[PDB]
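Weekly modeling sync, notes
Attendees: AB, CL, MP (scribe)

Item 1: holo prediction request
CL wants a bound-state model with 2NC before deciding which constructs to order. AB pointed out that an apo prediction alone won't tell us much about the pocket. Agreed to run with the ligand included and paste results into these notes for async review.

Input as submitted:
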Amino acid sequence: PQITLWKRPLVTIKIGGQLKEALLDTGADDTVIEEMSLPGRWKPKMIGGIGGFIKVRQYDQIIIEIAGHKAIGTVLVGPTPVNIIGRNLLTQIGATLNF
Amino acid sequence: PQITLWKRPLVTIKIGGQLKEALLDTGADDTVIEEMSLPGRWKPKMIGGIGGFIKVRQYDQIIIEIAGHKAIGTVLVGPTPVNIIGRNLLTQIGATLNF
Ligand SMILES: *O[C@H](C)[C@H](NC(C)=O)C(=O)N[C@H](C(=O)N[C@@H](CCCC)CN[C@@H](CCCC)C(=O)N[C@@H](CCC(N)=O)C(=O)N[C@@H](CCCNC(N)=[NH2+])C(N)=O)[C@@H](C)CC
C-alpha cells in the first residue's frame, strides 16, 4: 500500500499469536512492543528518545506479520507508550519514503 | 526521491538561513528541533516520546526547506535528542510510506 501521512500510520500486526496495533516509525531504529511474552532468551537494553530512556528486553529472530507482510528480526519488549515498528523490520517488508 | 530505511533517513534542512541535519520521522506528529533562535512569539506545548514528556516552544508559520522542498509550518524547539521532521511537514512535501 501507499500510506499517506495525514494521520498516524497505524497498522495491524501479528506477533506471538496476538494481534496488536502498531505505528510505522521511520524515526525508530528498532521495533518496540508493549509487555508480552516471547520465546527464547533475552538481554536487557536501554533505548531513548523524546523524554529520555526506558529499559526493555531484547528478543532475537522473532517473526512479525505487519499489515499482511511477514518479517523476522529483533523485537524489544517493555513499557513503550505505543507499539512501534522500526527500521529493522520496515526494511524487510520493503518500505520506503517517497516524495 | 525514494528513501530506503537500511540507514537512518537523514536529510539536510534549512531553517533561519542555516543548514541542519534532521530525521524524516513518520512516527512523529510534529517537527521538533534542537535549541535555536526563531523569530516571533511562541506558545507552550508538551510532547511525548518513548521516555516520557517534555516541554517545547511552538513557533508557527516558519519557513523551512526539507531536502530541497519548501515548507512553511509549525516548528517545535526544545530538548529533543535529534532533529525530527514530523507528519505536519512531511505532508507538505508530499511524502508517503510505500510497500
Ligand atoms: O535508540 C536509537 C539510538 C534512537 N534513539 C535516539 C536517542 O536517537 C531511536 O531510534 N529511538 C526511537 C525513537 O524514540 N525515535 C523517535 C525519533 C528519534 C528520537 C527523538 C521517534 N519516535 C516516536 C514514537 C512514538 C511515541 C512512543 C516519537 O517520539 N514520536 C513523537 C515525536 C514528538 C512529536 N510531537 O511529534 C510523537 O509523535 N509524539 C506525540 C504523541 C504520541 C503518542 N500517541 C498516542 N496514541 N498516545 C505528541 N504529539 O507528543 C525509539 C523508539 C527507540 C528505538
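Recorded for review: The interface with chain B takes residues 1-6, 8-9, 23-29, 32, 47-54, 69, 80-82, 84, 87, 90-91, 93-99 of chain A (CB under 8 Å).
Action items: CL to compare against the apo run; MP to circulate these notes.
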